[PDB]
Amino acid sequence: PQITLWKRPLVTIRIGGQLKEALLDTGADDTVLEEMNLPGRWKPKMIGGIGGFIKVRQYDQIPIEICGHKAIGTVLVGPTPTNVIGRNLLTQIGCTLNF
Amino acid sequence: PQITLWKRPLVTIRIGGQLKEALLDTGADDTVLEEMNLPGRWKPKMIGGIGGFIKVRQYDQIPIEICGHKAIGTVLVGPTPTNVIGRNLLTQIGCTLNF
Numbered sequence: 061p062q063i064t065l066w067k068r069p070l071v072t073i074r075i076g077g078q079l080k081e082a083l084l085d086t087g088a089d090d091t092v093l094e095e096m097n098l099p100g101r102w103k104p105k106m107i108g109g110i111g112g113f114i115k116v117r118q119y120d121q122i123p124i125e126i127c128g129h130k131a132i133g134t135v136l137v138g139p140t141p142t143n144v145i146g147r148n149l150l151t152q153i154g155c156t157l158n159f
Numbered sequence: 160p161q162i163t164l165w166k167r168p169l170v171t172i173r174i175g176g177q178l179k180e181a182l183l184d185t186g187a188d189d190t191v192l193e194e195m196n197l198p199g200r201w202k203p204k205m206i207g208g209i210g211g212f213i214k215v216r217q218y219d220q221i222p223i224e225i226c227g228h229k230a231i232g233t234v235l236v237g238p239t240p241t242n243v244i245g246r247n248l249l250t251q252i253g254c255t256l257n258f
């Protein structure tokens with residue numbers, strides 16, 4: 061689909077049989093979701109943004125459905141202000157910026 | 160043009176007669192630029208990102224060019240690690256997200 065930007069680009073995602081809302085974020089290198097439970101082993105990691113750095117849990121090869129399109133990649137979980145879908149998954153679904 | 164997301168979507172912008180590299184960020188509601196001495200009056204403001212809030216200076220009706228596309232709007236100036244073009248300006252140049 062084609063998404064305009066007069067409103068935040070939010071979409072529904074399906075992760076672990078759970079529905080959630082996320083922001084399509086081209087300025088984010090990675091994908092971060094609010095604190096939640098995910099199966100599998102996770103490794104501690106730190107990511108920085110405006111404001112500073114935070115500690116997150118890193119899950120690898122996680123299947124995630126974004127607005128109908130399937131993806132499988134790294135998902136970070138931690139105290140983020142909102143669920144963000146980064147470039148690592150945006151590229152998996154063939155997402156581009158146009159103008 | 161059409162921009163892929165394999166790399167950070169960086170483009171050239173011109174503001175205050177200066178050429179700078181900026182990140183096209185669909186996840187940012189506002190536009191944030193690295194510290195610079197713009198002329199004109201401004202208002203103090205706090206904006207929050209991944210790891211907290213940073214204090215910035217708000218300049219209104221600032222003319223700015225993004226890849227040869229002229230636009231004008233609000234710009235925040237502060238200690239941001241990188242220049243960020245938010246949705247307030249992306250909409251002006253008819254930028255869309257597509258997949």
Ligand SMILES: C[C@H](c1ccccc1)[C@H](C[C@H](O)CN1CCN(Cc2cccnc2)C[C@H]1C(=O)NC(C)(C)C)C(=O)N[C@H]1c2ccccc2C[C@H]1O
Pocket residue numbers: 085086087088089090091092107108109110141142144146184186187188189190191206207208209240241243245
């Ligand atoms: C320019 C940022 C950057 C910093 C350093 C290096 C490159 C880019 C970039 C910004 C995010 O695209 C957008 N981000 C999403 C979450 N919400 C949250 C919010 C916070 C407070 C109030 N409302 C909403 C904040 C919003 C944001 O930072 N907005 C502004 C107006 C303050 C600019 C960002 O945070 N990037 C990092 C990043 C992000 C997620 C996962 C991994 C990584 C690594 C980095 O690429």
